[PDB]
Design an enzyme around this catalytic site. Structure first.
Site, PDB file in Angstrom:
ATOM      1  N   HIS A  28      10.275   4.547 -12.124  1.00 23.81           N
ATOM      2  CA  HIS A  28      10.749   4.703 -10.756  1.00 23.81           C
ATOM      3  C   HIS A  28      11.496   3.456 -10.308  1.00 23.81           C
ATOM      4  O   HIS A  28      11.123   2.334 -10.658  1.00 23.81           O
ATOM      5  CB  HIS A  28       9.580   4.964  -9.810  1.00 23.81           C
ATOM      6  CG  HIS A  28       9.054   6.364  -9.862  1.00 23.81           C
ATOM      7  ND1 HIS A  28       9.001   7.177  -8.752  1.00 23.81           N
ATOM      8  CD2 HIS A  28       8.548   7.090 -10.884  1.00 23.81           C
ATOM      9  CE1 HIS A  28       8.488   8.345  -9.089  1.00 23.81           C
ATOM     10  NE2 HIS A  28       8.206   8.318 -10.379  1.00 23.81           N
ATOM     11  N   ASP A  85       0.855  14.621  -8.406  1.00 22.06           N
ATOM     12  CA  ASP A  85       0.827  13.442  -7.560  1.00 22.06           C
ATOM     13  C   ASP A  85       0.027  12.337  -8.239  1.00 22.06           C
ATOM     14  O   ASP A  85      -0.771  12.586  -9.145  1.00 22.06           O
ATOM     15  CB  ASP A  85       0.240  13.774  -6.191  1.00 22.06           C
ATOM     16  CG  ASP A  85       1.289  13.781  -5.094  1.00 22.06           C
ATOM     17  OD1 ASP A  85       1.023  14.331  -4.012  1.00 22.06           O
ATOM     18  OD2 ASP A  85       2.382  13.226  -5.310  1.00 22.06           O
ATOM     19  N   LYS A 125       3.445  19.875  -3.397  1.00 26.20           N
ATOM     20  CA  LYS A 125       2.767  19.524  -2.157  1.00 26.20           C
ATOM     21  C   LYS A 125       2.043  20.766  -1.653  1.00 26.20           C
ATOM     22  O   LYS A 125       2.447  21.886  -1.990  1.00 26.20           O
ATOM     23  CB  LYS A 125       3.752  19.016  -1.096  1.00 26.20           C
ATOM     24  CG  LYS A 125       4.667  17.911  -1.581  1.00 26.20           C
ATOM     25  CD  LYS A 125       4.385  16.609  -0.870  1.00 26.20           C
ATOM     26  CE  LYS A 125       3.903  15.548  -1.832  1.00 26.20           C
ATOM     27  NZ  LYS A 125       5.030  14.794  -2.431  1.00 26.20           N
TER      28      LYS A 125
HETATM   29  O1  CAP Z   1       4.333  10.272  -2.557  1.00 27.49           O
HETATM   30  C1  CAP Z   1       5.565  10.393  -2.408  1.00 27.49           C
HETATM   31  O2  CAP Z   1       6.067  10.121  -1.296  1.00 27.49           O
HETATM   32  C2  CAP Z   1       6.430  10.879  -3.556  1.00 27.49           C
HETATM   33  O3  CAP Z   1       5.651  11.841  -4.302  1.00 27.49           O
HETATM   34  C3  CAP Z   1       7.671  11.560  -2.991  1.00 27.49           C
HETATM   35  O4  CAP Z   1       7.299  12.692  -2.239  1.00 27.49           O
HETATM   36  P1  CAP Z   1       8.315  13.354  -1.182  1.00 27.49           P
HETATM   37  O5  CAP Z   1       9.604  13.719  -1.866  1.00 27.49           O
HETATM   38  O6  CAP Z   1       7.674  14.589  -0.614  1.00 27.49           O
HETATM   39  O7  CAP Z   1       8.587  12.387  -0.063  1.00 27.49           O
HETATM   40  C4  CAP Z   1       6.796   9.733  -4.498  1.00 27.49           C
HETATM   41  O8  CAP Z   1       5.728   9.527  -5.394  1.00 27.49           O
HETATM   42  C5  CAP Z   1       7.101   8.425  -3.773  1.00 27.49           C
HETATM   43  O9  CAP Z   1       8.359   8.505  -3.152  1.00 27.49           O
HETATM   44  C6  CAP Z   1       7.107   7.233  -4.720  1.00 27.49           C
HETATM   45  O10 CAP Z   1       7.790   6.180  -4.079  1.00 27.49           O
HETATM   46  P2  CAP Z   1       8.749   5.161  -4.874  1.00 27.49           P
HETATM   47  O11 CAP Z   1       9.459   5.900  -5.976  1.00 27.49           O
HETATM   48  O12 CAP Z   1       9.777   4.596  -3.931  1.00 27.49           O
HETATM   49  O13 CAP Z   1       7.936   4.031  -5.441  1.00 27.49           O
HETATM   50 MG    MG Z   2       3.768  10.770  -5.149  1.00 28.74          MG
END
Ligand code: CAP
Ligand code: MG
Ligand code: CAP
Ligand code: MG
Ligand code: MG
Ligand code: MG
Lengths: 464, 118, 464, 119, 227
Positions: free
Chosen positions: A316, A192, A164
């Site tokens: 996931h 990401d 991030k």
């Molecule tokens: O974009 C986000 O939020 C994350 O990179 C987590 O970041 P953080 O740890 O900073 O929150 C994940 O890709 C999502 O959680 C995917 O969701 P899921 O697996 O539930 O589909």
């Molecule tokens: Mg993500």
């Protein structure tokens, strides 16, 4: 002979006394008819317009055998706690599908019946795949057991972290935050979902700056390391070009978003990865537009069994406690369908059929989405070993840096594994374990003080 | 039951499945083109067959005809289009004749129908 | 400096006084917050987690400029006739997207925000594409004007028919029902969406038996004819092989299902069809799982503007009167977005923004589904010329055969065109026109007697 | 020969007029693909100069109207026809659509007068 | 209708009151008309023969829309300190150019107007490229910031040197004058513009003798070098 006109649907496609074969596909629908329509005409109107049928009589029906190529409804039951709601069962012959295509199955079963004027809702829950149809697919490229042997890692769950902020970093600063994370105790790192190739950072010079940090951090701790490189693109000719440059550099793993990219493009990358020796990680994006509400859509327990047939080594699966929605029993029900070889019927978890996989390798589940060091004992009792845990903001948001913030995530996991394989209760306790462990490690007492009072508690929408 | 004839039954596109066209019904399709500000034209050819090429998609032979004089820019009355058809009919009494229209803002034709057969 | 902890979302991402640029993408959301959440924190939580943002503070934010790479909410209004429902507006900078990808835009805008624990519903309505972003796409392979010139057909709408039964016919019987249809007056013919390659009929010997009927029916009437061939497959290597065999036979047109196949595979076929001179027809399958309900999903007016950027020459658009659901004003609003070059804001049809296309060619709409000869005067007043009309069971269900059943579909269209371009009302009249026409044609008085009392009237779900 | 000397501070003008190429340097080039004599024999045209015409307006015509103004010119007595220098591939007319519509007029005008034509 | 003959250029292409769009290309010319020619006919004769126009009337103009595909002059000013010299402004619609070609733009704007018999001079000064046209080009391969990071050089300008004599050196002597330069403090070295492949030194064995000096001078000072 031939007589032209219009007829009812329940004169051919409703057969209440029928015994199914072991070479048939089965489906379960939940429906809501419009006022003035019997519950049995509507059920027969769903089986008719998916295999063979239309709104009128035609003369070419007599050039072939129709009882041999038709679908039929054989069971209807009412839902308890609702006036206008029912469950319908439909069976399909085997000679209707093309061997090796996930596209054809979804085109046939769900392509036109959701938008009829004589309905108000419709949702698909489960399916059954006979062993005579799943033998024509390749499946996961490697599996669970062939992947734990290449990396030499036994006895504990794996760990990871994502980088991030999401967008806005250059290519040299992006690879400096990878070395500091990987040298402190983590195993993986990740891009990401929306980092592909953009004016602030192009794809080819990021693949090179990331490969320089892995070599420097692997010769310093004596353990194998990795990073998921993203191969999503706008055409196939460009998606196939970013997968060869990873193999040229000698990297172990790549990525793909399989719902916005499509099912045809996800079955060629899987074939390439088997033929050249790579690992595949799968991200479920744009899945809550279809899965979230109770009375319309497709459940994720169905979209998981198509991914297992198409191909992949990770997936996931969400967390129980976090910023995203999930339920304990449903999750415990559909993880078993991903990891096991024989699964039985259990209506207390939401399983309508019995499924056998005749020796196809399993898939590793991944939990992510807003978890910190106070959730560690709870996430070890639910999933156990054979899983991956990811902390993106719970690593890069430490008050001392990226490397101190990865020692606190490894000490807290090992301290829980040791206590578990001694005979202690990880549900009643868990506060005492972390509190005792944060006494010979000063990097854990710092993280234990910034996130002490953070929880997410709201109402749930699905509720089985 | 009745049977549709497959032998010696050619057709000529739009309006060719209706009963034959009279002289009144012809000067009602010109007042509709003039009400939308389009430009009349005329054509003629001795044959009407179509040929192809072995392996080239979208290529056909026999789509161009010959133009009588020039498009009639700035025309408001329908009595001149009717007189030009008669001049065309005396010079070449053994050809087909077609009537066209032009939209100059979208650059595409808008009408076509046959008025004379050999 | 750097201070670790948790902060509110409305301290950075809520900017009520902001003036947008002409180089920005805009979006409109309809949302429903959970109890105890202000309508502005929830709005600011949608812009934050789509561009740059997470649940905690990180130290790498200070290595770059954030007011330059962030999205922001600038307007919120309440819906009239609801205690808890609102509309939110969000703007996006241009440097966040990759040039030439439809996949990246959907991965960024809608990939994670639909499944938050602090919401109960969310639906996307409209988007605005600036001219500086649509100039990096190819678009439709040919268009509307270059396709009417290759076929030499001016002055009336086009006609077609699909072959039934859906599944169960052999390869020699499939091509005998094409010759009889095409020799009676039709222009096109078509496969079903789920006819790819199956044990009863394989793909390579059907392409050959169909090409033998076109040549025999073209030399008998003196008009150009065609047939859509289906190129949907399970991998890209197989989809590219069925497109090169239609070019060697000199065929004009093919097919593809672009929602179950994917967006990456649909941009490769479009590129191939431009370099070799073919036409493309697009079928919208599996679209009512997302579009049907009012409070959750994506409207079809948004999925329409992605096809025009990806590439295609035709598209299905539904009918007002038939067996499938549709509404008059919404349809009249989103056809204009498909066929025109400049469209303005009209909230009585459901348009939130003004859109320019700076000289991209248009797309032909197609109407199909349960329509017979009594609907002819109503389908000519709504669509006019520049459209395609298809009758599958209204042709093969005639009491005399396939060829008599295609003369009655052409006489009824020409009789309406002649009456329209004479000054008559096609709404008050229309019964008298058909009744008068069925006096010198014996094939129309027979079809007028079997389908005299057939209509579909139910309630509608969306209701603008 | 001419890469840096035209912009010296100790000059105000400079122009190049002629050059001489020895026979030992021009023997290492291929030259014209066919020539003058091999081109008059493929076309069967002797005793008079050749004739041509270019199509106007420069820009703004579609692909079907561009090819029907070629047939009428070629059927009246000309030998060639030509594009303009700035007609390559543009939103109003793409290159592959025009190569096909022009090839249909040459065949129709060559079978009617009995002479070879081109574009 | 259609009327054949010859007409003036200033009846269609001179529009003094016109407001330009943000999707247009603009150009500025300095011109010198011949005696007996108004300064406004000459300006309109430059916009006409670059987009659509010729010396006579044709019948095919009525098959399309001309006010939509034409260029037009909208401003003329006189130069201070010259009896006969002016500056002219011309605007061009966007749909006249091919996406991704630098060749087409120069073929259209400057291909025939410099050699008219009714002029004595003409010079082009500036152009404006709208953002909707430059988004269809790739641009520089790397840039300024991605190139300073690969080489690890911050805080000062870079240095270089080219090899002399221009022509007449062999392939082994050419590569031993590179090692001595690079080992003393320089960063780059360069060929001359007219050294391609010639009887005294062929291209393939010079690429090999130069690559042997970079490795020897890079392991001796601990800095990255190039040629
Ligand atoms: O974009 C986000 O939020 C994350 O990179 C987590 O970041 P953080 O740890 O900073 O929150 C994940 O890709 C999502 O959680 C995917 O969701 P899921 O697996 O539930 O589909
Ligand atoms: Mg993500
Ligand atoms: O399967 C069918 O029903 C059709 O073949 C029509 O057949 P009939 O003419 O026999 O009904 C069409 O594909 C659907 O109408 C598509 O629906 P839409 O265009 O609305 O998406
Ligand atoms: Mg269909
Ligand atoms: Mg010229
Ligand atoms: Mg030099």
């Amino acid at each position: 002979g031939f007589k032209a006109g219009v007829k009812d649907y329940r004169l051919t496609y409703y057969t209440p006394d029928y015994e199914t074969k072991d070479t048939d596909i089965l489906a379960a629908f939940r429906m809501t008819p419009q006022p003035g329509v019997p519950p049995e005409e509507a059920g027969a109107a769903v089986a008719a317009e998916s295999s063979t049928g239309t709104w009128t009589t035609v003369w070419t029906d007599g050039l072939t055998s129709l009882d041999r190529y038709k679908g039929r409804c054989y069971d209807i039951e009412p839902v308890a706690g609702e006036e206008n709601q029912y469950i319908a069962y439909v069976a399909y012959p085997l000679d209707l599908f093309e061997e090796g295509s996930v596209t054809n199955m979804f085109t046939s079963i769900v392509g036109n019946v959701f938008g009829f004027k004589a309905l108000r809702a419709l949702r698909l829950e489960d399916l059954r795949i006979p062993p005579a149809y799943s033998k024509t697919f390749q499946g996961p490229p490697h599996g669970i057991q062939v992947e734990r042997d290449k990396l030499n890692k036994y006895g504990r769950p794996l760990l990871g972290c994502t980088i991030k902020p999401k967008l806005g970093l250059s290519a040299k600063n992006y690879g400096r935050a990878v070395y500091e994370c990987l040298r402190g105790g983590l195993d993986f790192t990740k891009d990401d979902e929306n980092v592909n190739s953009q004016p602030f950072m192009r794809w080819r010079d990021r693949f090179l700056f990331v490969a320089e940090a892995i070599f420097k951090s692997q010769a310093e701790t004596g353990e194998i390391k990795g990073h998921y490189l993203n191969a999503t693109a706008g055409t196939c000719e460009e998606m196939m070009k970013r997968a060869q440059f990873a193999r040229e550099l000698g990297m172990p793993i790549v990525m793909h978003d399989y719902l916005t990219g499509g099912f045809t493009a996800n079955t060629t990358l899987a074939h390439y990865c088997r033929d050249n020796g790579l690992l595949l990680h799968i991200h479920r994006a744009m899945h809550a537009v279809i899965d979230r509400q109770r009375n319309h859509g497709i459940h994720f327990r169905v979209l998981a069994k198509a991914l297992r047939m198409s191909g992949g080594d990770h997936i996931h699966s969400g967390t129980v406690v976090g910023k995203l929605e999930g339920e304990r029993e449903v999750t415990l029900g559909f993880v078993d369908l991903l990891r096991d070889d024989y699964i039985e019927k259990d209506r207390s978890r939401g399983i309508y059929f019995t499924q056998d996989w005749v020796s196809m390798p399993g898939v590793l589940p991944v939990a992510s989405g807003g978890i910190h060091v106070w959730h560690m004992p709870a996430l070890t009792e639910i999933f156990g070993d054979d899983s991956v845990l990811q902390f993106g903001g719970g690593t890069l948001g430490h008050p001392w840096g990226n490397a101190p913030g990865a020692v606190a995530n490894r000490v807290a996991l090992e301290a829980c594994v040791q206590a578990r394989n001694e005979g202690r209760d990880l549900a009643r306790e868990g506060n005492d374990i972390i509190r005792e462990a944060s006494k010979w490690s000063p990097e854990l007492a710092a993280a234990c003080e910034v996130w002490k009072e953070i929880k997410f508690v709201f109402e749930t929408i699905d509720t089985l | 039951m009745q049977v549709w004839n497959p032998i010696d039954n050619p057709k000529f596109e739009t309006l060719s499945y209706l009963p034959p066209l009279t002289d009144n019904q012809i000067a009602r399709e010109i007042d509709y083109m003039l009400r939308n500000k389009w430009i009349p034209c005329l054509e003629f050819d001795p044959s009407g067959t179509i040929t192809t090429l072995p392996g080239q998609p979208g290529y056909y032979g026999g789509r161009y005809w010959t133009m009588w004089k020039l498009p009639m820019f700035g025309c408001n009355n329908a009595g001149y289009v009717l007189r030009e058809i008669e001049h065309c009919k005396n010079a070449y009494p053994g050809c087909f004749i077609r009537v066209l229209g032009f939209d100059n803002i979208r650059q595409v034709q808008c009408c076509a129908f046959i008025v004379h057969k050999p």
